[model samples]
Target: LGVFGERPIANTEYSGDYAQRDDAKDLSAKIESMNLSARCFNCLDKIGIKYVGELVLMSEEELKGVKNMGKKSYDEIAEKLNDLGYPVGTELSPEQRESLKKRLEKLEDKGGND
Candidate 1:
């Protein structure tokens, strides 16, 4: 249903929209639009997520909260949305990320009463 076409049926296997061919083509790209696997389609499809417009209208949190969509699904959806010329999570520097990793390791090896 995530795939594009005419007579767009919301949430069904045939979910589509009033999109032009060129626009729908872009929807399949990781760096172009919100492309995902068939399973992801089914998950989103059931919640009336047929096109970008409906998705875009909702906040990131609300988008992930649809029915059974989990954190992983949320992240995936967020990643897809990021492709549509948007910004998201911080890009950590190599050293900064390493420091965070060490911090995590320390936390695991000890208590958090520091």
Candidate 2:
């Protein structure tokens, strides 16, 4: 029996990894290993952003347009890309562009037929 709206206490066991300091240290090391500048890292961390694949897919202008992102951050990202052998603002290859155009045309044709 219980008083009105009061919950009964149930015994529980904590079985998962319970080492807090070790977890904190590991997390700090992971954060440090990110290699992004402090400002870029902070911005990305605040927005829960991760991974170069996701970042590279975004336009530099879009990244620069983010709150707290400035020319420095944009340059930092550009430098990183350059170090990785990606020229900033590089256009899609002719083959890729043609394929994209064909895909768009197909979509348009389908829409017109519908």
Candidate 3:
């Protein structure tokens, strides 16, 4: 949801299945599959991002928010993904991703949800 918008869907019904060109199956591979350094790997791991599938969908702001994720490490991820033809945005821009779920009042309202 950053400069590049959303990550493309894999092996969809659309045309030649662009993702298939790069082997859609690779999307399911663990992030460890990439040659990430210990620091970058640890940052991503601690942030709960483990799959290529999920990483590709992360916005620049989202990635930057990860604890201990610095500029260099961020660039490493962007460049690495680009090399794999699954690039995400590296551009610095405004964003506030609040995916934080509110579960505190689960039973109070019988008809409330996203």
Candidate 4:
């Protein structure tokens, strides 16, 4: 038999430990170092989103749909992603083509290319 019918009232204390705070601060520092605007960073932070990796994968409309994100912020982030060799809008960068070439070569080596 269960002591509390599957759910028990347990004394729980949630504390923001120093280590956790320090880690968060470190991450914030890194984000700030990326030269992104304050509003952009805040929008991502508020939504528990981090890093440009996932941001670059999103379309302009998708990015603008995030809470507190406006056209300006979306454009800024999109431009940054483009500068970083990511495909944004309808265009692909030379670096992206090179990356695709390498991927194709790898696939060919593995006999996955038809």
Residue-level lDDT of model 4, residues 22-114, one tens digit each, is: 112122123345587988778876654455533543445566578688668766766555444443443333234344344334422333323
Q: Per-residue lDDT of 1-114 in model 1, one digit per residue for the tens?
A: 488757755653443332222332233222224556555556666765555533444445656477776667666666575555332232332233344344334423433332
Alpha carbon RMSD to native, model 4: 18.8
Total clashing pairs for each candidate: 0, 0, 0, 0
Q: Against the unseen true structure, what C-alpha lDDT does each candidate score?
A: 0.47, 0.46, 0.58, 0.49
lDDT (tens digit, per residue) of candidate 3 on 27-110: 556677888777877887776666665566566668768879877877787767765664565334312212111221221343
Measured on C-alpha atoms, candidate 4 has an lDDT of: 0.49
In model 2, which residue pairs have backbone atoms overlapping below 3 Å?
none
With a 3 Å backbone cut-off (N, CA, C), the pairs that clash in candidate 3 are none
Candidate 3 lDDT (Cα, whole model)? 0.58
Query: What TM-score goes with each of the models?
Result: 0.42, 0.44, 0.54, 0.44
Q: Candidate 3 or 4, higher lDDT?
A: 3
Q: At residue 99, what lDDT does model 3 achieve? A: 17
Q: How close is candidate 4 to the true structure, as a TM-score?
A: 0.44
Arranged by lDDT with the best first, the candidates are 3, 4, 1, 2
Residue 90 lDDT in candidate 1: 23
Worst 10 residues of 2 by lDDT: 19-28
Q: Please tell me which predicted candidate would have the highest TM-score against the true structure.
A: 3
